[PDB]
Antibody
Framework: QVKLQESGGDLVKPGGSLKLSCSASGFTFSRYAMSWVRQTPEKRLEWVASITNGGSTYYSDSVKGRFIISRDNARNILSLQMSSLRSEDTAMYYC???????????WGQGTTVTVSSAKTTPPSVYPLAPGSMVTLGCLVKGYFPEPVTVTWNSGSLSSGVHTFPAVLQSDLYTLSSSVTVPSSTWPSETVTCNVAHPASSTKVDKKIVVKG | DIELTQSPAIMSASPGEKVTMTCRASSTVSFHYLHWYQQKSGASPKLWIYATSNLASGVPARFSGSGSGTSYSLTISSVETEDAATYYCQHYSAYPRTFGGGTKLEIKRADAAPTVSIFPPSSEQLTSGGASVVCFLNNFYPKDINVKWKIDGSERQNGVLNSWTDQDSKDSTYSMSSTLTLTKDEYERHNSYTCEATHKTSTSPIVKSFNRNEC
């Protein structure tokens, strides 16, 4: 199957530079045009750049002069280098097979980029244990910027989880995650909240333990 | 300058209904290159319809697309729960934005009461001088739910922050978290903490509660 994995998203000061990578597999990469598309916090989809298989480049007027789209047909890697970054470049960035004319037929899951002068704050992570089925919680508080990645038992508990959109207060985000398991499985078996904050290069594991 | 306008920006439909959404251009645009993408919550877009009328691989038969010139549409013949998503039209001739603003489709279901869970602040959180009392309201419908917090019987509004998930495309439900944040000192000056859930047509709230002294 065709797979596109983006990486390189980070917090960057305005005027700074950042390189995004897209690793392609499951198809002959050198035969296809490739594109980047961004999505703003307002959920507006916005084309960034495209590159033909021969290497001809096309850029949106929003990034002209500042962004470089490039490719390596030997490594099967699509790149985007962003220089002179602006606040307005803050967005989720997706890599696509194809381009605007004949359509973009496969999209990766994306990387987040935030352009801000504010420094990174890693989150504090707190377990939420209760005071047939049991719901447990994880509170991830006081971090900047988005995103955090929240999993339960390293992604083994997939169903019965709800991770809520972060709320911003006093220049810091806070989110919660709930997970619901059969009461015979907890506290009998381990349930742990795993939090990843790429911008501060932090990972936190917090076991949910009985008591309040 | 040529813009793609999508209507309606937001639509709600019930399973089994036929739904149509439109994509209109400022000036004529070639049907050969008018495309549609579907984006589900927490996921990237997928190609849905290409060259006006052709379904991308794996896209259900109930989808169709029509149009030419300045006027295009996407139609679902019999909408299903899994169709909850935002739909975007796109054409290279459109500038400065190649994408339309999208149509967000909500899928109706019968009313469902939330599963409500209340949590006292993490004891470890208290060590920071802060106290977040958390209440989860999970898997309910419709979206417009009301949460009330009570401390020792009296309603409290200050320090409450609420967050809703997007509609679950599996079962058409919503979930939301309500967090009441107090100081460690304010929290320990009280015993009874209550999260109440109600909606417009409810005659009986769902109530979850704990006491600071005994669980």
């Amino acid at each position: 199957q065709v797979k596109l994995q983006e990486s390189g998203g980070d917090l960057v000061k305005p005027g700074g530079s950042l390189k995004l990578s897209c690793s392609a597999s499951g198809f002959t990469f050198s035969r296809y045009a490739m594109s980047w598309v961004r999505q703003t916090p307002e959920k507006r989809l916005e084309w960034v750049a495209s590159i033909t298989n021969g290497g001809s480049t096309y850029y949106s007027d929003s990034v002209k002069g500042r962004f470089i789209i490039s490719r390596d047909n030997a490594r099967n890697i699509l790149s985007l280098q962003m220089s002179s970054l602006r606040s307005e470049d803050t967005a989720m960035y997706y890599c696509e097979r194809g381009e605007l004319t004949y359509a973009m037929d496969y999209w990766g899951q994306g990387t987040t980029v935030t352009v801000s002068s504010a420094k990174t704050t890693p989150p504090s992570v707190y377990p939420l244990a209760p005071g047939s089925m049991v719901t447990l919680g994880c509170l991830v508080k006081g971090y900047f910027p988005e995103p955090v990645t929240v999993t339960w038992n390293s992604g083994s508990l997939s169903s019965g989880v709800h991770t809520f959109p972060a709320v911003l207060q006093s220049d810091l985000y806070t989110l919660s995650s709930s997970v619901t398991v059969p009461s015979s499985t907890w506290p009998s078996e381990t349930v742990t909240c795993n939090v990843a904050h790429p911008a501060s290069s932090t990972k936190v594991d917090k076991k949910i333990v009985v008591k309040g | 300058d040529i813009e793609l306008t999508q209507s309606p920006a937001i639509m709600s439909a019930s399973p089994g209904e036929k739904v149509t959404m439109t994509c209109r251009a400022s000036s004529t645009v070639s049907f050969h290159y008018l495309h549609w993408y579907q984006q589900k919550s927490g996921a990237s877009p997928k190609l849905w319809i290409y060259a006006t009328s052709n379904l991308a691989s794996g896209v259900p038969a109930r989808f169709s697309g029509s149009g030419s010139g300045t006027s295009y549409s996407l139609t679902i013949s019999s909408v299903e729960t899994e169709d909850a998503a935002t739909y975007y039209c796109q054409h290279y001739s459109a500038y400065p934005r190649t994408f339309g603003g999208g149509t967000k489709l909500e899928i109706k279901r019968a009313d469902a009461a939330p599963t409500v869970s209340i949590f006292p602040p993490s004891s470890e959180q208290l060590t920071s001088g802060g106290a977040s009392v958390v209440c989860f309201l999970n898997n309910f419908y419709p979206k417009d739910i009301n949460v009330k917090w009570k401390i020792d019987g009296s309603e409290r509004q200050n320090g409450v922050l609420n967050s809703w998930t997007d509609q679950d495309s599996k079962d058409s439900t919503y979930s939301m978290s309500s967090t009441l944040t107090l100081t460690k000192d304010e929290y320990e000056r009280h015993n009874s903490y209550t999260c109440e859930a109600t909606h417009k047509t409810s005659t009986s709230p769902i109530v979850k509660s704990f006491n600071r002294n005994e669980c």
